[PDB]
Design a protein around this ligand. Structure first.
Ligand SMILES: [Cl-]
Ligand SMILES: [Cl-]
Ligand SMILES: [Cl-]
Ligand SMILES: [Cl-]
Lengths: 256, 256
């Protein structure tokens, strides 16, 4: 239908595809980047810092179109257990290698031990990394390998904002835990309240391996919580998998 | 479906409902305004100058939500037979009465008798009206419902731009014909070439249904880019029945 075609075209405009698994190779990363970069190009691709120079120095000769998508380097992945100094170094290297953005996973496990200490660590990590990112975008990933309660997510969100996050990202893309209506609601509340007490701050809804229909509901959630004006690249991104990206393209390509 | 719900929600964010017939009454205007202003409110309502004060000073006493939609006053309606001075006087009064925007119909018939003269009349009408609207938005309506050749549509568009239009509106609503893919394409080319200030396009669709209206969103993205369909530079003008179709569709989405 026209409605599915319009929804898929809109989703493509905000989409960021992940190529973050333990088993990625240059070949698997290249395949993902090629589909990301086909006109109309999506926003970007997320990879571990290892792959940035392959994409930016080598793949571009094979597939020049990849120059037209952003590369977002996933630092402190997959465990979130590095120190501010080491994660800052990862980010420095990623930016040198050609990354356009950084996504930084927090030490989410610390929130299970001592919330106050966990919040302190988030503020330090995020503020440290923001110093090396300069005016580029720093997305802070609030969840990793396990499901944590709403109160923890809310407190992680606030700490990340206080530390200087340019974007709050629901989830890493690894494991089984991704955005839910509940966590998108809590993250939206945290951001809304931070802006009232108060820069342009976004929300990235990372949906895992779900299909277009479920992804579309998150789009609707975002507009309901944060208004139509939030549906712009500086304030919104959708993170998903390769199969979801292929579904979106198949749908859009059916429009005459 | 979620796809129809998202498309409906998107259209509500662009919508300007018409209540422009000579037969309108306080009662008919109130009915349209109530559906226009229901949360989430559409952009605005188009009325003749005679109903601006009614909406802004009186209706608001029983329907306070109406303060949250814009009132766009239709000047030189319904036939485009005024002079720059008579149309300026309508605009001045409408703005005094609380109008937020002005929608000015051109003397479209003049283009059929002599193109140069028709262009000259547009440029002087539009520039004179723009002087009184000041920083508020002036939309110039290029057609009153009669089918005119492509050369005419294109030249009327350029003359309206040179005259100072802030928006190009396809058609009046009270006319027998409305926006088509053909006219939107011509208007888009004219605006693109003129740009090589912020200028918008308003696609007035008459009494068509939601599906036909959706085709225009895809046309706009393809021809003018995804960034072209934002409220600041894009509007959809349509009837009360279309507004109700959109709102009914959106209200079927579960926000809980
Ligand atoms: Cl908004
Ligand atoms: Cl559908
Ligand atoms: Cl496109
Ligand atoms: Cl908007």
């Amino acid at each position: 239908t026209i409605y599915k075609q319009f929804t898929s075209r809109t989703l493509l405009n905000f989409f960021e595809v992940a190529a973050l698994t333990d088993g990625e190779t240059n070949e698997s990363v290249a395949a993902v980047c090629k589909i990301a970069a086909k006109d109309p190009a999506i926003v970007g691709v997320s990879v571990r810092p290892a792959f940035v120079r392959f994409i930016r120095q080598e793949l571009v000769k094979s597939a020049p179109e990849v120059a037209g998508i952003k590369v977002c380097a996933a630092v402190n992945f997959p465990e979130g257990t590095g120190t501010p100094d080491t994660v800052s170094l990862e980010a420095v290297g990623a930016l040198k290698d050609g990354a356009d953005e950084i996504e930084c996973l927090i030490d989410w496990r610390r929130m299970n031990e001592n919330v106050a200490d966990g919040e302190s660590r988030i503020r330090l990590l995020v503020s440290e990394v923001k110093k090396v990112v300069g005016p580029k975008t720093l997305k802070v990933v609030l969840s990793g390998g396990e499901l944590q309660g709403g109160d923890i997510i809310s407190r992680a969100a606030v700490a990340a904002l206080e530390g200087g996050a340019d974007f709050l990202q629901t989830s890493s893309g690894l494991g089984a835990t991704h955005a839910t209506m509940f966590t998108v609601h809590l993250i939206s509340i945290a951001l809304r309240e931070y802006m009232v007490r108060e820069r342009c701050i976004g929300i990235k809804i990372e949906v895992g391996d779900v299909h277009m229909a479920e992804t579309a509901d998150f789009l609707m959630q975002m507009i309901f919580e944060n208004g139509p004006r939030s549906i712009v690249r500086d304030k919104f991104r959708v993170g998903g998998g390769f199969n979801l990206l292929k579904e979106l393209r198949d749908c859009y390509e059916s429009w005459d």
